Motif scaffolding. Structure first.
Motif, PDB file in Angstrom:
ATOM      1  N   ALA A  24       0.797  -1.220   0.000  1.00 22.15           N
ATOM      2  CA  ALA A  24       0.000   0.000   0.000  1.00 22.15           C
ATOM      3  C   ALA A  24       0.834   1.277   0.000  1.00 22.15           C
ATOM      4  CB  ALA A  24      -0.964   0.004   1.181  1.00 22.15           C
ATOM      5  N   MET A  25       2.063   1.261   0.543  1.00 22.77           N
ATOM      6  CA  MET A  25       2.849   2.471   0.718  1.00 22.77           C
ATOM      7  C   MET A  25       4.069   2.572  -0.224  1.00 22.77           C
ATOM      8  SD  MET A  25       2.780   3.059   4.860  1.00 22.77           S
ATOM      9  CE  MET A  25       3.044   1.365   5.368  1.00 22.77           C
ATOM     10  N   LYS A  26       4.515   1.425  -0.760  1.00 27.10           N
ATOM     11  CA  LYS A  26       5.726   1.365  -1.559  1.00 27.10           C
ATOM     12  C   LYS A  26       5.556   2.166  -2.840  1.00 27.10           C
ATOM     13  CE  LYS A  26       9.007  -1.717  -3.827  1.00 27.10           C
ATOM     14  NZ  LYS A  26       9.111  -3.095  -4.294  1.00 27.10           N
ATOM     15  N   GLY A  27       6.558   3.005  -3.124  1.00 24.07           N
ATOM     16  CA  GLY A  27       6.539   3.758  -4.370  1.00 24.07           C
ATOM     17  C   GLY A  27       5.671   4.995  -4.210  1.00 24.07           C
ATOM     18  N   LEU A  28       5.633   5.795  -5.265  1.00 26.96           N
ATOM     19  CA  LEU A  28       4.855   7.017  -5.217  1.00 26.96           C
ATOM     20  C   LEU A  28       3.388   6.693  -5.015  1.00 26.96           C
ATOM     21  CD1 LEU A  28       4.492  10.068  -5.532  1.00 26.96           C
ATOM     22  CD2 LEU A  28       4.474   9.780  -7.958  1.00 26.96           C
ATOM     23  N   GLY A  29       2.781   7.428  -4.081  1.00 23.82           N
ATOM     24  CA  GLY A  29       1.380   7.274  -3.727  1.00 23.82           C
ATOM     25  C   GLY A  29       1.131   6.210  -2.665  1.00 23.82           C
ATOM     26  N   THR A  30      -0.141   6.126  -2.300  1.00 23.03           N
ATOM     27  CA  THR A  30      -0.604   5.331  -1.162  1.00 23.03           C
ATOM     28  C   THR A  30      -1.963   4.731  -1.510  1.00 23.03           C
ATOM     29  OG1 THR A  30       0.480   7.004   0.236  1.00 23.03           O
ATOM     30  CG2 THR A  30      -0.936   5.392   1.330  1.00 23.03           C
ATOM     31  N   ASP A  31      -2.167   3.460  -1.132  1.00 21.31           N
ATOM     32  CA  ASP A  31      -3.485   2.875  -1.106  1.00 21.31           C
ATOM     33  C   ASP A  31      -4.089   3.024   0.296  1.00 21.31           C
ATOM     34  OD1 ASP A  31      -5.815   1.413  -1.265  1.00 21.31           O
ATOM     35  OD2 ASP A  31      -4.863  -0.335  -2.192  1.00 21.31           O
ATOM     36  N   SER A  68       5.320   9.057   7.627  1.00 21.59           N
ATOM     37  CA  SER A  68       5.902   9.632   6.424  1.00 21.59           C
ATOM     38  C   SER A  68       4.878   9.688   5.287  1.00 21.59           C
ATOM     39  CB  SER A  68       7.167   8.881   6.048  1.00 21.59           C
ATOM     40  OG  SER A  68       7.620   9.376   4.804  1.00 21.59           O
ATOM     41  N   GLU A  69       4.027   8.658   5.144  1.00 22.72           N
ATOM     42  CA  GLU A  69       3.106   8.536   4.037  1.00 22.72           C
ATOM     43  C   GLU A  69       1.872   9.401   4.224  1.00 22.72           C
ATOM     44  OE1 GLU A  69       2.811   6.158   0.915  1.00 22.72           O
ATOM     45  OE2 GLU A  69       4.927   6.326   1.500  1.00 22.72           O
ATOM     46  N   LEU A  70       1.360   9.496   5.446  1.00 20.83           N
ATOM     47  CA  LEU A  70       0.056  10.091   5.719  1.00 20.83           C
ATOM     48  C   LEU A  70       0.223  11.493   6.289  1.00 20.83           C
ATOM     49  CD1 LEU A  70      -1.676   7.038   7.357  1.00 20.83           C
ATOM     50  CD2 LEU A  70      -1.452   7.624   4.890  1.00 20.83           C
TER      51      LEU A  70
HETATM   52 CA   LIG Z   1       4.169   5.791  -1.128  1.00 24.25          CA
END
Ligand SMILES: [Ca+2]
Length: 314
Positions: A24-31, A68-70
């Motif tokens: 869900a978090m790996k790479g650009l963007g987020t699920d 970091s993601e949210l």
């Molecule tokens: Ca990400």
């Protein structure tokens, strides 16, 4: 009676959950939906097992990654969900007192609604984490009669168990009545002593006797005879002694109704009560306000923040 909305998951696989969260978090963007679909369907203890699994299976730190993601209110709910139960209360108290300025509503809410056993755990954890006394911080950050109430609640000297002395019940009610006769301002120490010292069974009997002799609910007399944070603290004690789920229904109502939203209170109540008594809170909310709690959250929040709060509501 009915209990929590969030329960332990039955087919829980901590390694699989860690994998789901990393994907869900790996790479650009987020699920964000995937993050909710895992974390809001596990209990707080299971979440801790996911943190451990994430280190061993992914080679990374889960809370660090989520921070970091949210962002914003969504981040706050999720990180709060991920925090151990006692530590979350500890951290909320510290945030309420840190810097100049004090979140008095948070102090009242936690200190009046937790049991003496819970408050002991919180007090010890606060000391361990910060190297500061909870009681000393309360003393510095509040004043006058309000301070005395909060110190008492935090010091855990309230009588425990359920021993019922009828003569003492009568005396306490009579003393509160007499305090209401004054032509000059209530006897505030008497409210302090009775409401902070006596066991719950005893207090419920004092409330009943007080209504019998005064013809008023103790809440009405508190509202007429006291003011400010002290008044608010005394009301929270009475309400939590009568029915804590109802108290929390009121807090959610207040956090959302009208101009502005108290996101800090909304979040803390939803995170801290989801596993305990959210179904009861929902029931009381509907009885009190004639609207569903779900619909309040739906109508007052948006985005991923709304989505996760609605799962916590059920
Ligand atoms: Ca990400």
């Amino acid at each position: 009676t009915k209990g929590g909305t969030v329960k332990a998951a039955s087919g829980f696989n901590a390694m699989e959950d860690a994998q789901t969260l990393r994907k869900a978090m790996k790479g650009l963007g987020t699920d964000e939906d995937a993050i909710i679909s895992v974390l809001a369907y596990r209990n707080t203890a299971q979440r801790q097992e996911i943190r451990t699994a994430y280190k061993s299976t992914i080679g990374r730190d889960l809370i660090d990654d989520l921070k970091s993601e949210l962002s914003g209110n969504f981040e706050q709910v999720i990180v709060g969900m991920m925090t151990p139960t006692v530590l979350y209360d500890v951290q909320e108290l510290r945030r309420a007192m840190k810097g100049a300025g004090t979140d008095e509503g948070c102090l009242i809410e936690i200190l009046a609604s937790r049991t003496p056993e819970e408050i002991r755990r919180i007090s010890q954890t606060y000391q361990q984490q910060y190297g500061r006394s909870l009681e000393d911080d309360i003393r510095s950050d509040t004043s006058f009669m309000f301070q005395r109430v909060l110190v008492s609640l935090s010091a855990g000297g309230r009588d425990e168990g359920n021993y019922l002395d009828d003569a003492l019940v009568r005396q306490d009610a009579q003393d509160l009545y007499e305090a209401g006769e004054k032509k000059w301002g209530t006897d505030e120490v008497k409210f302090l002593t009775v409401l902070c010292s006596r066991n719950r069974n005893h207090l419920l009997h004092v409330f009943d006797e007080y209504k019998r002799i005064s013809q008023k609910d103790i809440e009405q007399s508190i509202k007429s005879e006291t003011s400010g944070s002290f008044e608010d603290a005394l009301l929270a004690i009475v309400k939590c002694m009568r029915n804590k789920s109802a108290y929390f229904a009121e807090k959610l109502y207040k956090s959302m109704k009208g101009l502005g939203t108290d996101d800090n209170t909304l979040i803390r109540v939803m995170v801290s009560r989801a596993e305990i008594d959210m179904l009861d809170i929902r029931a009381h909310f509907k009885r009190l306000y004639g609207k569903s709690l779900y619909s309040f959250i739906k109508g007052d929040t948006s985005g991923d923040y709304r989505k996760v709060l609605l799962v916590l509501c059920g």
